[PDB]
Ligand binder design. Structure first.
Ligand SMILES: CCOC(=O)[C@]1(CS)N[C@@H](C(=O)O)C(C)(C)S1
Ligand SMILES: [Zn+2]
Ligand SMILES: [Zn+2]
Length: 240
């Protein structure tokens, strides 16, 4: 695909059906799925796959159940370990559109409690479990059982009021989801669900929560350096 929004395909990318997978680190891969929007073309959305010992952890579904089932198929082929859990980073179609494929496979799913509360209104299937957060934004660990290397952080409202972010312990990788755009981005996208007053602070909070991450993975750009966080925050400063 040659998406209008999202990175092009590069050497080292693997095509598996209509999905693209890229290894980012020895136990981390980016999954990419595409949704065609009329007149506007293909929009890429990225999530993560993490191998944690004898199990696999997933961050975000694909746009659709069928695509998300193909993520599970790719995992079976390339990793061949059971998927223990998935965490989805807000209640939009690119992040939660494939929940049914996860639940059909018996995979435990997790989301911000607010994401689960909003899911019906957003046309999404709620996750099976709800994460809650301390006042400093870090997940309450009782609500993130056996998350292994996944360090979940709620940076505050930005892209949506429920957006969460995930650091991958033992790697240089932090996932900003749809909150962060890369340093070449010209806009933060549509902003219809956004908190334009708090966006900038939330972007900076994400950077401060994962201060040593050097590879920033995001939903709608290829991985970038930490400049993606600052550039996003500075674009968000102009919304106030
Ligand atoms: C089907 C709903 O999914 C969307 O429309 C997203 C989800 S974040 N929002 C858009 C935006 O923020 O402009 C986008 C093009 C980045 S994908
Ligand atoms: Zn979104
Ligand atoms: Zn998105």
């Amino acid at each position: 695909i040659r998406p209008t929004i999202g990175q092009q395909m590069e050497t080292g990318d693997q095509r598996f059906g209509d999905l693209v997978f890229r290894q980012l680190a020895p136990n981390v891969w980016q999954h990419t799925s595409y949704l065609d929007m009329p007149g506007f073309g293909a929009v890429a959305s990225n999530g993560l796959i993490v191998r944690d010992g004898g199990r696999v952890l997933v961050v975000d579904t694909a746009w659709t159940d069928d695509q998300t089932a193909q993520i599970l198929n790719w995992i079976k082929q390339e990793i061949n370990l059971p998927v223990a859990l998935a965490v989805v980073t807000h209640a939009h179609q690119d992040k939660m559109g494939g929940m049914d494929a996860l639940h059909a496979a018996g995979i435990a799913t997790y989301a911000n409690a607010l994401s689960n509360q909003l899911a019906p209104q957003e046309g999404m299937v709620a996750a099976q479990h709800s994460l809650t957060f301390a006042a400093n934004g870090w997940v309450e660990p009782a609500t993130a059982p056996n998350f292994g290397p996944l360090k979940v952080f709620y940076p505050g409202p930005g892209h949506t009021s429920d957006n969460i972010t995930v650091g991958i312990d033992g790697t240089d990788i932090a996932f900003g989801g749809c909150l962060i755009k890369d340093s070449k981005a010209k806009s933060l996208g549509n902003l219809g669900d956004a908190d334009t007053e708090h966006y900038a602070a939330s972007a900076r909070a994400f950077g401060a929560a994962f201060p040593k991450a050097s590879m920033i993975v995001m939903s709608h750009s290829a991985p970038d350096s930490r400049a993606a966080i600052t550039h996003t925050a500075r674009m968000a400063d102009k919304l106030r």
